[PDB]
Design an enzyme around this catalytic site. Sequence first.
Site, PDB file in Angstrom:
ATOM      1  CG  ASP A  40      43.577  39.187  37.774  1.00 56.35           C
ATOM      2  OD1 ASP A  40      43.260  40.070  38.654  1.00 56.35           O
ATOM      3  OD2 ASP A  40      42.680  38.404  37.311  1.00 56.35           O
ATOM      4  CG  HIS A  98      39.277  39.030  38.635  1.00 51.89           C
ATOM      5  ND1 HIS A  98      39.930  37.916  39.104  1.00 51.89           N
ATOM      6  CD2 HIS A  98      39.121  39.855  39.701  1.00 51.89           C
ATOM      7  CE1 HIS A  98      40.144  38.087  40.398  1.00 51.89           C
ATOM      8  NE2 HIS A  98      39.651  39.244  40.800  1.00 51.89           N
ATOM      9  CB  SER A 124      39.682  39.639  44.190  1.00 49.88           C
ATOM     10  OG  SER A 124      39.375  38.249  44.195  1.00 49.88           O
TER      11      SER A 124
END
Lengths: 10, 29, 257
Positions: free
Chosen positions: C99, C43, C203
């Site tokens: 991910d 993402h 992230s």
Amino acid sequence: LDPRPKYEPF
Amino acid sequence: DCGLRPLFEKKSLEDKTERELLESYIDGR
Amino acid sequence: IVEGSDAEIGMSPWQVMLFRKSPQELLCGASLISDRWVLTAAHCLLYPPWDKNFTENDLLVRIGKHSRTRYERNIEKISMLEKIYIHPRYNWRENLDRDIALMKLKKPVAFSDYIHPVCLPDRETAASLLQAGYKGRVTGWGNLKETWTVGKGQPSVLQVVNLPIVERPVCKDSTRIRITDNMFCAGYKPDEGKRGDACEGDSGGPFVMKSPFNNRWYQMGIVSWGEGCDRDGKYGFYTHVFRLKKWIQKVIDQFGE
């Protein structure tokens, strides 16, 4: 999604 | 050579929070 | 990361900044799993739902980062992604499955006291540490507190934190999202009485553990998501840098080093 919050950034 | 923090491991050094890391494993008391 | 301590000079030479060139800004953290190859959270770079979608062209990568602000002159590295690589089975639609993503630094980065790789788990290493209460430590520049903004905005320097994998059963019940045996949840629990969490823009950042075996530093994860940041009742969710170890592998020997 991301940790952030569907709805974008704030 | 990877995994080897060239300013710690790479020379008898340990970062002030890793010891915390260790203890989890032999369940530090 | 919520409730952390600020890192040290060299405590993580694999941390890489995910610095869009313009808006000259920051969107992630990635790690050095080579002399010239970088990996990250899915993402971080492919997100339709918020017209998230990039290219080597768009962004620029930085290394040797103590301060998140300044321009770390003679310590930091900065290279340009020669090609990106998403996981052909990625899920932006479902639950940020696989991910994961990687980026062949367009050119080769030479190491030093601030930049030094992380190693990819080997089923043993993958097997010895990956488990209940066995802390793992997350790094980063993210958001000091639940979604908002020197103040509780963002840190000047790199926040470091450490956390306990959770019980799969429990992992799966702090949420409502179908979670995959590809993703693991970190983070102290309620009574456990302590805090710590990765937050906004944390992230694609690492979940590297210390292997007591060869005392080598090994990246068990890639920061993926969560529901807030440090809330008595759930834990983030990360990527099994291993289940998918297959891949990471497959494409590095197809297009690089």
